[PDB]
């Protein structure tokens, strides 16, 4: 059996999610690592050579260039992947990370590229499996359906609420009920000023000034903000739970994370938002 581990110092987002109340204690604690779990990062790609991921990059898919390696040339996907599973910056330090490159070097893509990534994961994922979608756009029946079909295939899908300070129900895939839709908080437990809100959210996670990996060298880091940064904290926590419960359905993963979430600590959470902040005892 494993023994609990303590990371200290830890970046603030990790520091926050292993405790109920402020103040932060500079420590991130975990027992599971996500070993044996597969996280599919649907984003700008991943820097395959980053030290944060050594030995834990799995096969991927490049929607931008047929047969490409899905390497990150923007940084966003590497930062997101680092929060899921980076040795230093990640929630699940033993997870396998799969790059699914659907956005170009400028962070832009299309519904058609995103759906291609979801199609590849739905076909080729290995369970236990979780998808991270730190991206989105206008309402789309086709994109919503692709997300639903991934969930129906048994893959948990974690999606960013968006950064418009608006109701998330207006946007895809944030409005997909069966996906875990994630809002962003700050280090003092406020909803970040840009975070979308409302009944389509499932919970909040750290998303303001989050430190993680970057694509410019094997050791580069960056500190940036967005619901794209909150989402991978939840994906990482899902991966930890899946190590404990590898046959859990998406419904069961969501029920567990929502049961464990810290209630009623998010300030200015917004009209009809569930007042829940990610907590991991895994």
């Amino acid at each position: 059996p494993a023994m609990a581990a303590v990371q200290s110092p830890a970046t603030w987002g990790l520091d926050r999610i292993d405790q109920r109340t402020l103040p932060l204690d500079g420590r991130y604690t975990y027992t599971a690592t996500g070993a044996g779990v597969h996280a599919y990062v649907v984003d700008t790609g991943i820097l395959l050579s980053h030290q944060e991921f050594t030995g834990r990059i799995g096969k991927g898919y490049d929607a931008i260039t047929p047969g490409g390696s899905a390497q990150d040339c923007n940084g966003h996907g590497t930062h997101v992947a680092g929060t899921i599973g980076g040795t230093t910056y990640g929630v699940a330090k033993g997870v396998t990370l799969h790059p699914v490159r659907v956005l170009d070097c400028n962070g832009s893509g299309s519904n058609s590229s995103v759906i291609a990534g979801l199609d590849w994961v739905t076909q080729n994922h290995v369970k236990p499996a979780v998808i991270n979608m730190s991206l989105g756009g206008g309402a789309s029946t086709a994109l919503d359906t692709a997300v639903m079909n991934a969930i129906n295939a048994g893959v948990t899908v974690v999606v960013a609420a968006g950064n418009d300070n608006r109701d998330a129900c207006f946007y895809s895939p944030a409005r997909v009920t069966a996906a875990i839709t994630v809002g962003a908080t700050t280090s003092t437990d406020y909803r970040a000023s840009f975070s979308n809100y409302g009944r389509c959210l499932d919970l909040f996670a750290p998303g303001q000034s989050i430190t993680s990996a970057w694509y410019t060298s094997s050791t580069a880091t960056n500190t940036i903000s967005g619901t794209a940064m909150a989402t991978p904290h939840v994906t990482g926590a899902a991966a930890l739970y899946l190590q404990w419960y590898p046959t859990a359905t998406p419904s069961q993963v969501a029920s567990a994370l929502l049961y464990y979430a810290t209630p009623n600590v998010v300030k200015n959470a917004g009209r009809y938002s569930p007042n829940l902040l990610l907590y991991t005892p895994f």
Partner: protein
Amino acid sequence: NPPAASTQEAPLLGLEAPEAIPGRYIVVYKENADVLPALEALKAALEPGLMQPQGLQAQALRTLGLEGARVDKVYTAALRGVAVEVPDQELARLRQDPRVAYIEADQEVRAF
């Protein structure tokens, strides 16, 4: 005695959105349409490292009425559909296929 006009026209969605990408569309098939084997052949024709006979791709393009159309992505698992770039007349013909549930203009997405 000439046959009646076709009564098939799939919904065409999203053309008004500011992020619509001109000339690019996602064709989504009905779940009761027997399109799966044709889509699987078209996907395989794009698979790196794989050798495929010409006849499978040619048959799939006929079955789906996608001859001459620029097919960029093929969906079989998350969705039954294709991403295409076609002119207006070809788009109108694709909307007359009764197996098509709807067609969406492709749209720009951004990292959050």
